[PDB]
Amino acid sequence: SHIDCRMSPWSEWSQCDPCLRQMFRSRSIEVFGQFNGKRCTDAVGDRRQCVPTEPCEDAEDDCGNDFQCSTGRCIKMRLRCNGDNDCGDFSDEDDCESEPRPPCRDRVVEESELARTAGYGINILGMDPLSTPFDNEFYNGLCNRDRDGNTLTYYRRPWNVASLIYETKGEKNFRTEHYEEQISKKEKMFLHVKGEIHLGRFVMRNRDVVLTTTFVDDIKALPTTYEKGEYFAFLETYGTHYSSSGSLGGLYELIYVLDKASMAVNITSENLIDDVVSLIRGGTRKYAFELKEKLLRGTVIDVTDFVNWASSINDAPVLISQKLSPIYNLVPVKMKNAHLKKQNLERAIEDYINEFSVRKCHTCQNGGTVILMDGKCLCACPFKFEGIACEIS
Amino acid sequence: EEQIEAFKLSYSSKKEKMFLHVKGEIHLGRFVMRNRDVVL
Amino acid sequence: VTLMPIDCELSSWSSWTTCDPCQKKRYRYAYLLQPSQFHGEPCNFSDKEVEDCVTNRPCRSQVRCEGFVCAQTGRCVNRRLLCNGDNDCGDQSDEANCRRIYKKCQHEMDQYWGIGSLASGINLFTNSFEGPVLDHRYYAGGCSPHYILNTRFRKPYNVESYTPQTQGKYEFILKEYESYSDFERNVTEKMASKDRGKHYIRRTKRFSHTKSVFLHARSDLEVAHYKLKPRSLMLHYEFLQRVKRLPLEYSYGEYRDLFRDFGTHYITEAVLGGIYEYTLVMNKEAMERGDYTLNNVHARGILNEIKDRNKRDTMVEDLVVLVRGGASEHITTLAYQELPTADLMQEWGDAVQYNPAIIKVKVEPLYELVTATDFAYSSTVRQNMKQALEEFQKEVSSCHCAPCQGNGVPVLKGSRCDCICPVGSQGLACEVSYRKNTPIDGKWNCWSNWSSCSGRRKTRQRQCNNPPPQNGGSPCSGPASETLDCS
Amino acid sequence: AATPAAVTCQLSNWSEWTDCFPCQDKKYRHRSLLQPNKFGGTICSGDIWDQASCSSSTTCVRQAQCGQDFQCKETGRCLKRHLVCNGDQDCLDGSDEDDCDEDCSQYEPIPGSQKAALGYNILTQEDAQSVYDASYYGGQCETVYNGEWRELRYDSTCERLYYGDDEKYFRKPYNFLKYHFEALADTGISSEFYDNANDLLSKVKKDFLNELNKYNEKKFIFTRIFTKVQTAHFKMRKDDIMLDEGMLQSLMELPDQYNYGMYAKFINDYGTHYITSGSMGGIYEYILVIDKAKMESLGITSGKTERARKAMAVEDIISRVRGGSSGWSGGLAQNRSTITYRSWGRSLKYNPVVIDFEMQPIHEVLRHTSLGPLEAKRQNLRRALDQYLMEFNACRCGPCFNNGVPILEGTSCRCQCRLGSLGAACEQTQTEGAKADGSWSCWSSWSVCRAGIQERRRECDNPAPQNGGASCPGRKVQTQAC
Amino acid sequence: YRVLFYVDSEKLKQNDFNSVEEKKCKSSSHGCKELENALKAASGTQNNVLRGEPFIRGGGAGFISGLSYLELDNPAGNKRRYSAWAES
Numbered sequence A: 001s002h003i004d005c006r007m008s009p010w011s012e013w014s015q016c017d018p019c020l021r022q023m024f025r026s027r028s029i030e031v032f033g034q035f036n037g038k039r040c041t042d043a044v045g046d047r048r049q050c051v052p053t054e055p056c057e058d059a060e061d062d063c064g065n066d067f068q069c070s071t072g073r074c075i076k077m078r079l080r081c082n083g084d085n086d087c088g089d090f091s092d093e094d095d096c097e098s099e100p101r102p103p104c105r106d107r108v109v110e111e112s113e114l115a116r117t118a119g120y121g122i123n124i125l126g127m128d129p130l131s132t133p134f135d136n137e138f139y140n141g142l143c144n145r146d147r148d149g150n151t152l153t154y155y156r157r158p159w160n161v162a163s164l165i166y167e168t169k170g171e172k173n174f175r176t177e178h179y180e181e182q183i184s185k186k187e188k189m190f191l192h193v194k195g196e197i198h199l200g201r202f203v204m205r206n207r208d209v210v211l212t213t214t215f216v217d218d219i220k221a222l223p224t225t226y227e228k229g230e231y232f233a234f235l236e237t238y239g240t241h242y243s244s245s246g247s248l249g250g251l252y253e254l255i256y257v258l259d260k261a262s263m264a265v266n267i268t269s270e271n272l273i274d275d276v277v278s279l280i281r282g283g284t285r286k287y288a289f290e291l292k293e294k295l296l297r298g299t300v301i302d303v304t305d306f307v308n309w310a311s312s313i314n315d316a317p318v319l320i321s322q323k324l325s326p327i328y329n330l331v332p333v334k335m336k337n338a339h340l341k342k343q344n345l346e347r348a349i350e351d352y353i354n355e356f357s358v359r360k361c362h363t364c365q366n367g368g369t370v371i372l373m374d375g376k377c378l379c380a381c382p383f384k385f386e387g388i389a390c391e392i393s
Numbered sequence B: 001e002e003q004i005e006a007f008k009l010s011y012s013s014k015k016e017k018m019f020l021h022v023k024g025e026i027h028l029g030r031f032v033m034r035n036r037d038v039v040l
Numbered sequence C: 001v002t003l004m005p006i007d008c009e010l011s012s013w014s015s016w017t018t019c020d021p022c023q024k025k026r027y028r029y030a031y032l033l034q035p036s037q038f039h040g041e042p043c044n045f046s047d048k049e050v051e052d053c054v055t056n057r058p059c060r061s062q063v064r065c066e067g068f069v070c071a072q073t074g075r076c077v078n079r080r081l082l083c084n085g086d087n088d089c090g091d092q093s094d095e096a097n098c099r100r101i102y103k104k105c106q107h108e109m110d111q112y113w114g115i116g117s118l119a120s121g122i123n124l125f126t127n128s129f130e131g132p133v134l135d136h137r138y139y140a141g142g143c144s145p146h147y148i149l150n151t152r153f154r155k156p157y158n159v160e161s162y163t164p165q166t167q168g169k170y171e172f173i174l175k176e177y178e179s180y181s182d183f184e185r186n187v188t189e190k191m192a193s194k195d196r197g198k199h200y201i202r203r204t205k206r207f208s209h210t211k212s213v214f215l216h217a218r219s220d221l222e223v224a225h226y227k228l229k230p231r232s233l234m235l236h237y238e239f240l241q242r243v244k245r246l247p248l249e250y251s252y253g254e255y256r257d258l259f260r261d262f263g264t265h266y267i268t269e270a271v272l273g274g275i276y277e278y279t280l281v282m283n284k285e286a287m288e289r290g291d292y293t294l295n296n297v298h299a300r301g302i303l304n305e306i307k308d309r310n311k312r313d314t315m316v317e318d319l320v321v322l323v324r325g326g327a328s329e330h331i332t333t334l335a336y337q338e339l340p341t342a343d344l345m346q347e348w349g350d351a352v353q354y355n356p357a358i359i360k361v362k363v364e365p366l367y368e369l370v371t372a373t374d375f376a377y378s379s380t381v382r383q384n385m386k387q388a389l390e391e392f393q394k395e396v397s398s399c400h401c402a403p404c405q406g407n408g409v410p411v412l413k414g415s416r417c418d419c420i421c422p423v424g425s426q427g428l429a430c431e432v433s434y435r436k437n438t439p440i441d442g443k444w445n446c447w448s449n450w451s452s453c454s455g456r457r458k459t460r461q462r463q464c465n466n467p468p469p470q471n472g473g474s475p476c477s478g479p480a481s482e483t484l485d486c487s
Numbered sequence D: 001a002a003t004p005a006a007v008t009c010q011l012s013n014w015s016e017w018t019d020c021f022p023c024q025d026k027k028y029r030h031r032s033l034l035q036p037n038k039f040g041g042t043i044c045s046g047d048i049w050d051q052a053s054c055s056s057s058t059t060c061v062r063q064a065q066c067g068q069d070f071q072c073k074e075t076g077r078c079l080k081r082h083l084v085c086n087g088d089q090d091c092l093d094g095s096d097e098d099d100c101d102e103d104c105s106q107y108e109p110i111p112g113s114q115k116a117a118l119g120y121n122i123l124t125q126e127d128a129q130s131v132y133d134a135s136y137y138g139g140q141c142e143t144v145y146n147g148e149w150r151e152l153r154y155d156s157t158c159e160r161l162y163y164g165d166d167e168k169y170f171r172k173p174y175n176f177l178k179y180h181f182e183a184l185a186d187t188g189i190s191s192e193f194y195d196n197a198n199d200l201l202s203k204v205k206k207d208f209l210n211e212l213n214k215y216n217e218k219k220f221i222f223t224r225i226f227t228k229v230q231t232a233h234f235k236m237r238k239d240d241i242m243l244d245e246g247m248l249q250s251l252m253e254l255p256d257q258y259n260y261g262m263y264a265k266f267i268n269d270y271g272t273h274y275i276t277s278g279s280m281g282g283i284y285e286y287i288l289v290i291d292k293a294k295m296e297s298l299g300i301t302s303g304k305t306e307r308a309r310k311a312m313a314v315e316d317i318i319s320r321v322r323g324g325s326s327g328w329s330g331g332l333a334q335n336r337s338t339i340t341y342r343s344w345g346r347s348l349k350y351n352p353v354v355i356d357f358e359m360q361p362i363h364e365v366l367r368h369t370s371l372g373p374l375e376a377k378r379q380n381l382r383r384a385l386d387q388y389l390m391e392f393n394a395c396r397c398g399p400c401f402n403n404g405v406p407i408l409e410g411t412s413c414r415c416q417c418r419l420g421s422l423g424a425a426c427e428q429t430q431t432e433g434a435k436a437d438g439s440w441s442c443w444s445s446w447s448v449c450r451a452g453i454q455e456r457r458r459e460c461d462n463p464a465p466q467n468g469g470a471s472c473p474g475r476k477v478q479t480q481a482c
Numbered sequence E: 001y002r003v004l005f006y007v008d009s010e011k012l013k014q015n016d017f018n019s020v021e022e023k024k025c026k027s028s029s030h031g032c033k034e035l036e037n038a039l040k041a042a043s044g045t046q047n048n049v050l051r052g053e054p055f056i057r058g059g060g061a062g063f064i065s066g067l068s069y070l071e072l073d074n075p076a077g078n079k080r081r082y083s084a085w086a087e088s
C-alpha cells in the first residue's frame, strides 16, 4: 500500500567556518515515499549565518611565480601575452602591447563545438552530461590544429582533450526469431534491431587539467570540515564523476513482439498480445523525428534518410558511452587544504551511496520488482497485474 | 473476443475488448540551476 | 579446438663480441628458436642486448664528406645542390644562409604515384615493405619534364625509369558439370482359387543430381614500370644512420635489426599495377529415395502397406575478390560480391594509374647499397651483412611455424606466426568449419643447416605438412634435397 | 536461468605514503583495486591512486638532468640543439622558439597520426594518453604522398570536371618509420545452404486397423562476408623515440625504488601496450545465418485420431562498418548493396580507421628512447605490469550471458550483451537451449616456488559451455623463473 | 587486342526397360496364378566449359580494364568500350 516520506532528525550544528561565515548540520532520507504515498522533497542540508568565532587565514592562494589573472586561476605569461585568453576572463589586453598575436602565426583556425563539450560531468542520479568541469577554451597557448570530422575543414583542439579521434563506426545488429505449434494452435514472434554510429571518441588529459573558473572557485567555497550539504551541493551542480573519456555519435533501436494462441458442449478461447517501441538520439531534428517515427511502421526505408540522419550527427551528437572518473580528482593541489576537500568529497559520495539505496523499500506484490524515482519507490509487472504496487488484476 | 453458448432452453453470449497505448516524445533540451551564489 | 598454445622462445645468449673500435659498444644476441602461435605469449624483448665499452683500439670512421655535412642527418650533399631551392639534406639544412637561391623546376611536378613507397626495402619472406632505404625525395638537379596522360611528374634521382608500360590482361573461365540418375524397379505376384487369394507389390525410385558452377575472372593491369638504378644510389638518412651504427665485429643481433627496420633486399625492378581477381566456386548436390510396398492374403483377410520417401539438396559456394591498386570508392564497389559492371572496372583502372601495387618485382640484397663512398670499413660491413642476411633468412622463413588447420597459410610477421584462414574455416588455428574435409598443400620443415666441407648437403621432410591426409594438392615447389661445393 | 551474483565494490585499505619527492612536490599512495564490482552492486566511492601536496626534504635538481643540450624548463623535453629556433614548436613550453625556417607544416598530419601514437589497453581495448609524440618532427621535413587524394570538383568558369589538388601530401611525424599509401582490398564470401525432407508411412488391416505417418522438412543458410580495404599501412620507429611530453614527465615522476602505485598509474594513463605497426583501412563485415524446421506425425487405429505440427525460424544478422563517414556508415550499416559500398568507399578517402595492428608491452618504449637506459625504472614498470595484467584484467568481470563481452570500465565491470539488458540473465526471448561458449577465468597470482618450479594457473571457464557451446584455446598451467 | 573464347558442351541421356507377364489356370474348384515384373533405368549427364581471354597492350588504364571486361553476351567486345579503348 501507499507509504509517505521519512527522514532523520536534523544533526547538531556545526561550529562557524571562519572564511565561509556559515554553520550547518544535515538530515538523512530514510524512505523517499513509496507506492503513491506522500513523496519526499525536503532538504538534506540547510545552513545558518554566523559572525565567525576566530580569524580567517590569508585569502590569496596563488601558485607562486604564476600570473594572477582576474579569475584567480594559476597560469604562465606565455598564455596571456600570446593573446590567447587562456586564464578564463579575457584579460590578455592588459598583459602585452607588441606582437601578442595567437599561436597560429598566420593560419588562424576555427574551434569545434563537439570538442568544447568534452569532459561532461556525470551524476549517478539521471546520468546527465552536465556542462563541462573542464575549461576547453583554455588551449595552453597551443595552435593544436586537427582537421578531423567529416566537414573536411581544420579546427583547434582544446587543451584538456588528449585527442578527439573521429574513429568512425556504423553497426547494425539485427535478430529475429519465430515459432509455431499445433495439435489448438500457438504462434510466437521476437524482433530486435539496433543501429549505432560513432562519429568519434574524446579522451581527457589525466594530469595538468585546466578547470573552469567556476569549478575551481566553487571548490574554494567548500566547508573544510566534512558537512554533507555543501559537498552535496558541489556534487549535484558539477557531478559525482567526470567523463574522463567517451564516444560521441547517434543511435536507433526498435522492437516488435507478438504472442498468439487459439483453442451438447461448445468451448473455445483466443489470446493475443502486442509490444512495439522506437528510440532515436543524435542528429538534427527534421531527420531524426522523421526516422524514429518512420521505422516504427513497417516502411522499407530510403537509404538517403539514413545518410541524411547520420550525416547530421557531425553537427549534433549524443554521448553513447564513456569512462567515469570520481570527480574529486579535479581539485588541483597548490590550493589551500586541497586534500581535505578530496577526502570529504569521497566521504560525501559514500554518504550518497547510503541514502539513495532502493533495497530498503518494501516488497511489490505478485510478479513485480521495485524501482526508485525522485520521491517514489514503485513497480511495474507481468501477467496483467495492476496499480503502482501490483496488488490487483 | 470471448464467446459462451449452451443448450438443454437456448443460451448465448459474447464479449469484446480493446486497449491501445501510443506516445511520442520530441526532446529539445535539459537544465540544472546553480545551488550557490544564485542571482534572483 | 585441439590446442595447447606455443609460447615464444629466444635462445640463451651468445657470448659478447669484444668491444667495437668505432661504435664503442659490445653486443649479445639470441636466435628465435620457436615463434609465438595459437596466441601463446610473446618473448620478443626486441631480440637484442647491448652495453658500452672502455677499449682504445684505433678507428678510421672519418670517410670524408667532400661536399657539405647535413648537420642533423649526417648525410653529405654535393656542392651544386646547396641553394638549388630544394631539401637535399632531409631537414632543409642545405638551404640555410643562401646569398641567392636558384630554382630549376619551371612548373609544378607531381611525384610519380607510389615512388616514395618503392623507396623502402622488402622483407622478402613476409613479402612486405619494412622501411625507408633510398631517398625518393632527392632530385640531384633533375626537373626533366615527364608526362603520363596530361599530368607532369618529377623523377627521383635513384630511379632509372618510371613509365606507364600500359598493359592489361583479362582471363576468364566458366565451367559447368552436371550428372543425373534415376532407377525404378518393381515386382508383382498373385494367386486365387474358389476360397483363397494373394497379392504382392513393390515400387521404387532412387535418384541423384549434381552440379558445379565455377567461374574465375582475373585481370592484371600494368600501367607503370619502375626500375631503380644499379648503383651510385642516394640513401634515406634513417637507413644510413643504422648502417653507420653497425659493428665491424660480427654479432648477428645488431645486423638483424637493420633487416627488421629496412628490409632484407632493395627493390630494383618492379611492374606497377592493379589486379582484379574474382573467383566464384559452387558445388551443388541433390538426392532422393522413394520406396513403396504391399502384401495381401484372403481366405478372412489381411493387408500390409508401406511408404518411405526422402530428399536432400545442398549448395556450398565460395567467392573471393582481391584488388590491388586504385582509389577507395572504386575499390569497395569492385570488392562487392557481384561481377563488376564495366563502368566500375573502368573507373577502377583509371585510379590504378594514381595508386598501384607491385605486381612482379626483382630485388637485390641490401649489402650492395653498403659502399665505400658512404661508409668506413665498408667491405667488413658488407661481409658481416652477407652472413647476417643468410642467418636472417633462416629466421624469417616460415618453416618454424606449426601447420594451420583448414589449409591455412602462415606468414610469420614480427615474432608471431598467425594462420591466415581461407573462406569456409575460422578460429586461431583455422579449425572451425561446417565442412567435412579440405585438400592440404605441402611445405617442408626447416632445412638441415649444412653437412661437412669438401662437398656439402642440406635436407628437408614434410612429416605433418604432407598432402596425403584428407587428399591434398601439390607437395613441392623446389628440391627435396640440395648439395654444393664448399668453395 | 541462474540467479545473479551482484556485490558492492571494494577497494583495499590504503598503503602508507611515499615521501615528498623534490620537483614533483607530491606524496602518493594507492589502493590495490581489491575487488571492483561484479555486473551488479553499487560502485566504490574511492579510486586506485592519490596525489597530495608536500614540501621536499631537499632542493629540486636543475636542467643539467638533460646533459650537454637544451631542456624546456617548464616541461619535460630534452632537445638536440638544432631544434632551438628551427622555426617550429618542439616542446609544450615553446621556449625552443623563445628569444631567437621550417615550412613543412604546409601539409596536414598523416591520417591516423593520433590513434597510432596513443597507447592501448589489452584489458579494455581502449586507447590511452599519447605514448609517442604524435606531432614531434625532430626537424625532419619528411613528406608522404596521399594515394587516395583523387576527388572530383567542377569549374563553372572554364567547363572542367576534374580532380582536386587538395590532400595530395601529408607531413609524416618523426615517430612513424614509414607510412606507405598503397591501395588494397580483399573480400571473402561464403554461402552454404542445406535443405532436407523425409516422409514415411505404414499401414496394417485385418478382418483391426492401424495407420502411421511421419514428416520432416528442414532448411539451413549460412553466409559470411568479410572485406578489408587499406589506404595506407605504417610502422613506428624502434630507436631514438621522442616520447609525448605528458609521457616524458609522467615517466620521470616515477620512483627509482619499486612502489606499485606510480608505475600502475603510468600503466593506466599511458596504456598497457604501444602500437608498433598498423594498417589504415575500412573494414566491412556482414554475417547472416538462418535455421528453419517443420515436422508432423499422424496415428489412426480401430477408433481415435491425433495430429501435431511444430515449426521454427531463427535469423542472426550483423552489419559492421569501421571507417567511413557517419552518414554513409549509417547507409552501409542499414543496407548491403552496390549503392552502400561505393559511397562508403568514397568516405574512406576522408575518414579511415586503423583496421589491424601489432604491438609491444609499454616498458619496451623506454629502451628505444633518446633518454639512455632506465633499467631500474624499466624493471619496476615491468614488475608493476606483471601484477596489472592480473589486477585490472577483464578476466575478473565474471559471467556474461548470451556471449556478452566482459570489459572493466575504470573501477567497475560491464557485460555488454548483444541482446537485452546487461549482466546476468541477458535473455528472455531465447530458450534455455541457447548456445554460448566457455571463456577464460583469470590468472592466479604467482604461486609458491622452488629452485626449478614456479606456477601461474587458469581455468577454461567456471561453468561448462551453454548447451553445444564452444570453449577456450586450452591451458591450465604456465611457469616462471624460480 | 586479342581474344580467344571457347565454349564446349555435351549431353547424354539413356533409358532401358524390361518386363514379363505369365498366367496359368485350372478348372473342372477353379484356380489361377499371375506373375508380373518391370524394370526401368535412366542415366543423364551434361558438361559445359567456357574460357575467354582478352589481352590488351596500350590503352588508358581504365579503358583497358573496361574493354577487357569479358561479356558473355558479346565475347568480342561492346563496340563503344572498344572504340573508347581505341581512343585511350
Ligand SMILES: *[C@@H]1O[C@H](CO)[C@@H](O[C@@H]2O[C@H](CO)[C@@H](O)[C@H](O)[C@H]2NC(C)=O)[C@H](O)[C@H]1NC(C)=O
Residues within 6 Å of the ligand: C184, C185, C186, C203, C204, E038, E039, E040, E041
Ligand atoms: C513401377 O511402376 C510405376 C508405374 O506407375 C512406375 O512409376 C511411374 O513411372 C512413370 C514413368 O517413369 C513416371 O512418369 C511416374 O511419375 C511414376 N509414378 C510414380 C510416382 O511411381 C515406376 O516406373 C515403376 N518402376 C519400374 C519402371 O520398374
Ligand SMILES: *[C@@H]1O[C@H](CO)[C@@H](O)[C@H](O)[C@H]1NC(C)=O
Residues within 6 Å of the ligand: A264, A265, A266, B005, B006, B007, B010, B012
Ligand atoms: C454450440 O453452440 C450452440 C448455439 O445454439 C449451442 O446450441 C450448442 O449447445 C453448443 N454446442 C455445440 C452445438 O457444439
Ligand SMILES: *[C@@H]1O[C@H](CO)[C@@H](O)[C@H](O)[C@H]1NC(C)=O
Residues within 6 Å of the ligand: D334, D335, D336, D337
Ligand atoms: C539494399 O537495398 C536494395 C534496393 O532496395 C535491395 O535490393 C537489397 O536487398 C538491400 N540490401 C540489404 C543488405 O538490405
Ligand SMILES: *[C@@H]1O[C@H](CO)[C@@H](O)[C@H](O)[C@@H]1O
Residues within 6 Å of the ligand: A008, A009, A010
Ligand atoms: C530540528 O530538526 C527537526 C527534525 O526533528 C525539525 O523539525 C526542526 O525544524 C529543526 O530543524
Ligand SMILES: *[C@@H]1O[C@H](CO)[C@@H](O)[C@H](O)[C@@H]1O
Residues within 6 Å of the ligand: C011, C012, C013
Ligand atoms: C642469457 O640468456 C639466458 C637465457 O634466459 C639467461 O639465463 C641470461 O639472460 C643469460 O645471460
Ligand SMILES: *[C@@H]1O[C@H](CO)[C@@H](O)[C@H](O)[C@@H]1O
Residues within 6 Å of the ligand: C446, C447, C448, C458, C459, C460, C482
Ligand atoms: C636449405 O638450404 C637452402 C639454401 O640454398 C634453402 O633455400 C632451403 O630452405 C633449403 O631447405
Ligand SMILES: *[C@@H]1O[C@H](CO)[C@@H](O)[C@H](O)[C@@H]1O
Residues within 6 Å of the ligand: D012, D013, D014
Ligand atoms: C585509507 O583507508 C583506511 C583503511 O585502510 C581508512 O582508515 C582511511 O580512509 C585511509 O585514508
Ligand SMILES: *[C@@H]1O[C@H](CO)[C@@H](O)[C@H](O)[C@@H]1O
Residues within 6 Å of the ligand: D122, D385, D386, D387, D388, D389, D390, D391, D393, D442, D443, D444
Ligand atoms: C592475466 O592476463 C594478462 C593479459 O596478458 C597478463 O598480462 C597478466 O599476467 C594477467 O594476470
Ligand SMILES: *[C@@H]1O[C@H](CO)[C@@H](O)[C@H](O)[C@@H]1O
Residues within 6 Å of the ligand: C039, D439, D440, D472, D473
Ligand atoms: C581468454 O579469452 C580469450 C579467448 O582465448 C583470449 O583473448 C585470452 O587468451 C583469454 O585468456
Ligand SMILES: [Ca+2]
Residues within 6 Å of the ligand: C081, C082, C083, C084, C085, C086, C087, C088, C089, C094, C095
Ligand atoms: Ca638543396
Ligand SMILES: [Ca+2]
Residues within 6 Å of the ligand: D083, D084, D085, D086, D087, D088, D089, D090, D096, D097
Ligand atoms: Ca623550435
